Every structure is written in C-alpha cells, then in structure tokens.
From a paper:
Several drug screening campaigns identified Calpeptin as a drug candidate against SARS-CoV-2. Here, we have further investigated a potential dual-targeting effect of Calpeptin and, indeed, show the pico-molar inhibition of cathepsins by Calpeptin, its sulfonated prodrug analog S-Calpeptin, and the chemically similar prodrug GC-376. Binding of the activated compounds to Mpro, CatL, CatK, and CatV was characterized by X-ray crystallography and their antiviral activity against SARS-CoV-2 was confirmed in cellular infection assays. All three compounds bind in a highly similar manner to the catalytic site of each protease.
Moreover, Calpeptin binding was also confirmed in a CatK and CatV structure. No differences in the binding mode of Calpeptin to the highly similar CatK and CatV are observed. For all three compounds, Ki values for CatV are similar to CatL, whereas CatB values are generally in the nanomolar range.
Numbering used by the authors:
A (entry chain B): 223 to 443
B (entry chain A): 1 to 221
Write the structure that this text describes.
Amino acid sequence: LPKSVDWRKKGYVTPVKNQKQCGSCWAFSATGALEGQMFRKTGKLVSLSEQNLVDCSRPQGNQGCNGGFMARAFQYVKENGGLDSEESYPYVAVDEICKYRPENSVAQDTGFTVVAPGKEKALMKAVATVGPISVAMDAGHSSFQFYKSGIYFEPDCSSKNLDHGVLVVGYGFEGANSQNSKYWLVKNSWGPEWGSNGYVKIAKDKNNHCGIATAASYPNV
Amino acid sequence: LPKSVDWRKKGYVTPVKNQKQCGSCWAFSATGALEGQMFRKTGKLVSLSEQNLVDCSRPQGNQGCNGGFMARAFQYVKENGGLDSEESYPYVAVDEICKYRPENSVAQDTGFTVVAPGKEKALMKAVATVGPISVAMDAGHSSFQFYKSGIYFEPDCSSKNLDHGVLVVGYGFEGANSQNSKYWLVKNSWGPEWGSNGYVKIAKDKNNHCGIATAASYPNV
Ligand SMILES: *[C@@H](O)[C@H](CCCC)NC(=O)[C@H](CC(C)C)NC(=O)OCc1ccccc1
Ligand SMILES: *[C@@H](O)[C@H](CCCC)NC(=O)[C@H](CC(C)C)NC(=O)OCc1ccccc1
Ligand SMILES: [Cl-]
Ligand SMILES: [Cl-]
Ligand SMILES: [Cl-]
Ligand SMILES: [Cl-]
Ligand SMILES: [Cl-]
Ligand SMILES: [Cl-]
C-alpha cells in the first residue's frame, strides 16, 4: 500500500462544512463518504445535502440534531432511491420537516460496506483503495476541541465509547521515516476555523487511537 | 443574485496547485477559469497545463516565470486553437521550450469577457452566472503570505497597483445577515498548505479591496 494517501489531491473532497449547533456530525461524515464515491463513479464532485439526511432519516433510526449514524444515513439513501444536492436542499442546522424531491437527487447507493472492526490495517487498505471513509471517534475531550496542529494524541481517548462521526480522507507520516509518527488525515465538520483549517491528524497505528477503526464504513454506489 | 456561491461544491474546481518558485500565478488563474468553463460545457473536470501557457504565450505578451496576464493567456488559447492537459504537459516551474501538441488539447476558447473595472457588483453577477472568474489583486503583504483564517482585510492594500493573479470561486457572508461580513472566496496557487487549505476569503463590497474587481475576466468557450 502507499506510504501516504490524500484524497483531497485527487478531487474527491468538498470544502470543509460546519454543523453549527446541531448534533449532525453523522450526516456530514455520511455526505463526505458519498461525495467521494459519487466522484469516483462519475467524475463530478457535488456537495450533498446534510439537511436532507437530518430531516428525512428518522424512519431509519437517526435522530436529526440529537444524533445518528452514517450507516443509517446510507440505508436511508438506499430505501429512498436518492439524496438531494446541498444547493437544492440547504443546511440550516436545526431539525425540520422533510423536503426531499427526487427531481433534485444527485446521488444513490445500494447499501454500505463495513471495515473490519478495530483493524487499522483494514482501514488503511480501504482508505487506499476506495476513497474517503466514514468513521466514528471519541471527540469528548477538551484537547480535541482546542486542537491546532500536529499529531493528535489524547491519553484518555476511548476506542470503544465513541461520540462523533468524521471522514478519513487519507493517511501519512511526519518526518522522514514512513513508519514513524503515522497519522490519519481527518476532515471534521466544525468549520475551517477549527483545528488545522478544519482538519486533524490523528495518531495512526497506536492501538486504534480514539476508535477511528472501530466502526468505519462507506456507501456502495 | 444568490446570497452565496461556491463553485467548488458543484465540481467546477480542481484541487489547489502550487506555482513554487516561478511567477506563474497568472497561468494558474487562467487555467482555473478555463477548467471551470470547460466543465460547464462538457461535464468533465480536466486539469489544464500552466506549463503550456508559461512556455508558449510570449508572442501574446506574457513572460513566463517573470509574470503575465490572464487576458493574454486567453488570447493565446484562442490564437493557438487549444491548450494541453496538465497530465500531458506537466508543470515544472521554470521557463522551457514550447511543446504544445494539438493532439493533447482538451480546451479551447474564442476570446474572453472582461468585467468593467472596479465594479464589484458586476463581478458578483459574473461569479453567480458564469462560474469561477480570473482576477488580479494586491498580494504583496506579509499579512497575505501568512494568512490563515477569517476575512482578509489589509489597510496597505491597493485597488490599482496589483501584482498577483488568482481565481474567485464564489462569495458569501458571515452569520444570518447576507449583507454583512461579505467576502470573495478566492483560490490561490501557493499549494494547499498556504492559507485555508489554499483558499482565502477577501473582504467584499469594501471599496474594491486589494483590487479584486479591477481586472477580472473569463474565457469564452
Ligand atoms: C456529533 O455531532 C453527534 C453529537 C450527538 C449529540 C447529541 N454524534 C452522533 O450523532 C453520534 C455519531 C456516532 C458515534 C458515529 N451518534 C449518536 O450520538 O447517536 C445517538 C443515537 C442513539 C440512538 C439512536 C439514534 C441516535
Ligand atoms: C504572480 O505569481 C506573478 C509574480 C510575477 C513576479 C515577477 N504576478 C504576475 O504575473 C502579475 C499578474 C497580474 C497582476 C494579473 N503580472 C505581472 O507581474 O506582469 C508583469 C509583466 C509586465 C509586462 C509584460 C508581462 C508581464
Ligand atoms: Cl475548505
Ligand atoms: Cl455508522
Ligand atoms: Cl503503515
Ligand atoms: Cl488579465
Ligand atoms: Cl480577442
Ligand atoms: Cl451583496
């Protein structure tokens, strides 16, 4: 596998978005993974609607601004037959009545693939051969809220008790040695003013740090 | 006109490039504008060759790594009958022999449209209705070099004596009021590591700040 991967360089990733005061991280992780797979299939990078996911996927078990899961989002897209563009269905960061229109759909999926739980080498393989991957992580620490640069490593991080969905867009290493200071390249949904212009490097191959490989998945397009 | 526009979210913009040690900003601004118009016309996003413009547009009045102008680059593409892909004519950040190959051409233009000098409302209309727009600006400040986040506003900026070509990919505002804290969304060519993932927000409707609306143009495809 490559020593480094960054899907941003290949046209798979939309700009950093901001969920604002709504617990919709799962919808942003899901649209980021679907954006990547739809681009891999058609060559067109089109921002997808998190608001469509927040408003319309309660039947699949999501709870809008009160939380949800990327897999349930991919299930909704499948049961629904489509997902609207962000342009047609804008994000307002609150729970609202479903406004989905098939005429505005720009994406579809047949379900999703799960990466082997807890296996960082399985995740590395999926990132290198599929594109961006939705993952869950433990973001419940002030060190993450205030993160700025470098490789994120939090001693109190859990790999089991996760509370935030994000998008792995690559991996790499700091310094000249490929096996030293490895990291996962993660796109957050807290705007570009958070972290390193909206991104964070999370320690890689350090015992599934913060649970990045515990519950990873991607849509099948 | 829309309250905000972001052509990156619609597939019109290639990933951020890096001119390195060559004064070829004008060529990157020109390829970015043609990449957007060729995508609007065909639905295919193809990276274009800045190196073809650097090496071949001296007859039109450009000077390669010593500087140039987007309008002269669109004139070269028109007179030349085409422009090659980045893949077929790679960027090497130095003045080299013209190696234009018609069989590798993936873009054409019949000339260009200019935006009336100094008219930010005319620039806003062009961005909303056409796609990304080539523009000149005053980038000669340490504040721009070390720019990292927020709306860029530099007191020492000129709206008349400009030195750097960039690409306006959209516009927006901060918060709920669409008329307050407005900005131009600008793609630079100093690599993704510069600024905010290679982008900068420049103050909009603040007296043509840094000259963004002084010499704007786009190719006619
Ligand atoms: C991130 O913005 C949110 C914050 C939720 C605060 C209330 N986190 C989630 O949505 C999280 C993401 C997974 C760990 C990937 N899931 C979650 O909180 O789900 C809650 C839930 C429980 C049962 C049924 C539906 C949702
Ligand atoms: C940006 O990389 C370059 C830096 C040039 C350093 C020498 N800027 C330009 O090319 C600039 C862009 C315009 C303002 C849009 N143009 C410029 O410097 O042109 C110089 C020139 C004069 C006469 C004939 C050709 C070129
Ligand atoms: Cl971004
Ligand atoms: Cl999930
Ligand atoms: Cl490794
Ligand atoms: Cl010009
Ligand atoms: Cl002309
Ligand atoms: Cl306005």
